[PDB]
Design an enzyme around this catalytic site. Structure first.
Site: not given
Lengths: 246, 246, 246, 246
Positions: A149, A163
């Site tokens: 990500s 996260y």
């Protein structure tokens, strides 16, 4: 990418989104793909129909791989069904909801790292001997590809801190796995989506829009193919419309 | 660094090594330091004697901060004892032993991530409201500093994968904390040691030797001081003899 | 930082801004500073008065170090005047005006790269033997510190492309110099300001405002001091209010 | 990659090595490729024969694009010959020999930056309006791809300092060009080879060997294709057998 024909590719969290788009794109080269779902509702017949209509084949598998057992279950079923793994795509993960740091408790912290960290560690651990076997048989490389990500690099949004960190965790463990497992002829690479489908977040993207899942899949195909990426390991390709330029 | 006189500085894993060297050096500026020990044998009177002889003051605390409870205990004690907190230094962590990927189980994984991730998340979480208060009263900034690692960037050694990844986790979660908490005038920064205390690992270091703990301490002082680093947050300083040059 | 007393520190582009703020702060530790001006109007007596009133000493030098000759002149003068050199601070540089890519000609390209690349290459080249000598006599380390930029990492503003690239050039050439010259006990490190002195550029900075020159100076002191940063080389410290978190 | 058929791709330094391998690989998809040589001896008939026998077409062009004039000459000839550019591949560059910092003079510094910096700046500058035109006609993206280097990240070898820096220069100017030119629907991406064809340098490569030019070409194809990399800009793909894992 004609080398992908018949290649056996287990893709976690592939019942929808980036995982499903990748599955279909790999199916265009004749791959055999293990599709997998956590809890999201899904239609296996429909999904496997797209793979087959695309030129490929596969099966569907269900597992809440937030748990380690569930992760060895998944890998087992794939392996019984197709007799081994050529490519593992760790795509399962996600926000598990947002909390400010001061409202984070053990449950939350653990839900996030189970979904994003443990899953990938264990999914990959169990595959290794089969990944090893298949490179040894082909005399090329087998591959791992994980979904990283943008948040791995720049912290993610408010409430997504754990996260974001779990993706940095992933980006770096790959580097470790390159040291342990390159001698086994197994490659490791990452695709790092940015924003994928507000109009403020678009302003921060040079291309001025969110990505589509179709635009993410080719990077996985690329990393999946020994022909294309045989000398490539330890890398991240960021697919984000210019949103971050590492 | 005269701004450090009287500053209340909780340092985890400070009974020895880098954390103790830092404690002493902060004490030279008249800081008040909370020293902390997890498992290792230690001599509180000796250690606090050094702080006091260096010109500072402090106290010693015991906690196995692999557990969240342990982490809330530690913070609470510090705050009772000194009535608040201007700087938190997350220095506790370490290998928790070595395992090849294939021998990693839920225990090992969770022992590493509790020592390195959970500790820092929860240590830092419980500190925030006090850090916020202290910046509010001073009208400057309070600080978090954590010990990162060269391994956060390049994967760590074989068998150290999970530890290395946990440092990347920390490096990235700091970036998140800058977004959430800069509004509270709290800064966040990292010191990333390389090799600190074989004779081929020296060959990889331009300066040709391992660092000493004395050579690590000043970077913490720097990040601790609003006078020195008040416009600095979200950063890593790597202290490694040239071993990696990001 | 008491180790700075009497240290001879040549600072390019130090007649104002960051370089002058640094000069003053070094002077507070009793450094002897070579101040330098290129084009800008300045008042040597005023500037040297500040150094002396701060507790230091120095001299002022004039050179248009966009030219190599100019760069060998500057170094030579400094060395005549103080008989050597413990620290070189390459701070001269800047935009040299703005051009879209399509209007960039050989002149513009060469004006930017001479101000930012050539200056630093040659300033640093001519210094090396003296830096080497000074480390040899002290038995510690001598230092180079250069002013980098946030633009080195993320491309800079529109029209500033060549300037931004020249900072990346500097950030990377330092890494080379660590390989060549660590054997000579010379360290090399960078300070990378973000925005320093619109009201939307503030929105991009977590701390919500531009830095001041006073807030930049301490990072240089830190890198200048063997006591503080003797095991640190090959590094960048970004001083930017959170604007970028590498 | 079927989108590459008929695409017009000018590749600098393509008479040999990575550039020629890429040319041939692009020719397999039916691209029309402008091959170019600086001074290296070459056989245009042979080289264009491989392209044609691969399924493509092209022409050969000669230029010492260390000079700006030479760079507008090259771009002009390509454009007369094929009536525009869909992809520019800046592959020309290289060491121009090795010098220690203390033996670097203006000639050398300038030879290196002319070969690696100026060439790319000007090659790209002149293409832009044609790159713009072609994206506007297709309604997709046109592309720039440059050859970067591992040395851009970690300093390069002793004597190659200015070369190493020039690649960092390139890696960062791309980031700038993403800001100026994304609105023109032109993408910018880099391929960063490691070692490509001593047995010590191999030890530092997880895959234990140097790359071949055949292993580098697919990454360029990938970045060349809007179908594959249409949402990808501002990126670097490092192709190095694990030698560096950014």
């Amino acid at each position: 990418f004609s080398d992908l024909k018949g290649k056996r590719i287990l893709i976690t969290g592939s019942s929808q989104g980036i995982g499903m788009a990748t599955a279909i794109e790999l199916a265009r080269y004749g791959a055999v793909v293990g599709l997998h779902g956590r809890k999201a509702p899904a239609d296996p017949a429909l999904l496997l129909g797209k793979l087959r209509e695309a030129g490929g084949d596969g099966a569907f598998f269900r597992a809440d791989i937030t748990k380690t057992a569930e992760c060895q279950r998944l890998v087992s079923a794939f392996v019984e069904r197709f007799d081994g793994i050529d490519v593992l795509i760790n795509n399962a993960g996600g926000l598990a909801g947002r909390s400010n740091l001061e409202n984070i408790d053990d449950a939350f912290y653990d839900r996030v790292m189970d979904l994003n960290g443990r899953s990938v560690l264990m999914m990959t651990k169990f595959a290794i001997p089969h990944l090893r076997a298949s490179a040894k048989a082909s005399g090329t490389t087998s591959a791992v590809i994980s979904t990283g990500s943008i948040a791995a690099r720049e912290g993610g949004g408010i409430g997504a801190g754990v996260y974001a960190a779990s993706k940095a965790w992933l980006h770096d463990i790959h580097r470790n796995w390159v040291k342990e497992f390159t001698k086994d002829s197994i490659r490791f690479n990452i695709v790092a989506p940015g924003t994928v489908d507000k109009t403020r977040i678009a302003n921060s993207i040079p291309m001025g829009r969110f990505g589509t899942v179709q635009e993410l899949a080719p990077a996985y195909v690329f990393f999946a193919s020994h022909a294309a990426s045989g000398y490539i390991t330890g890398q991240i390709l960021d697919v984000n419309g210019g949103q971050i330029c590492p």
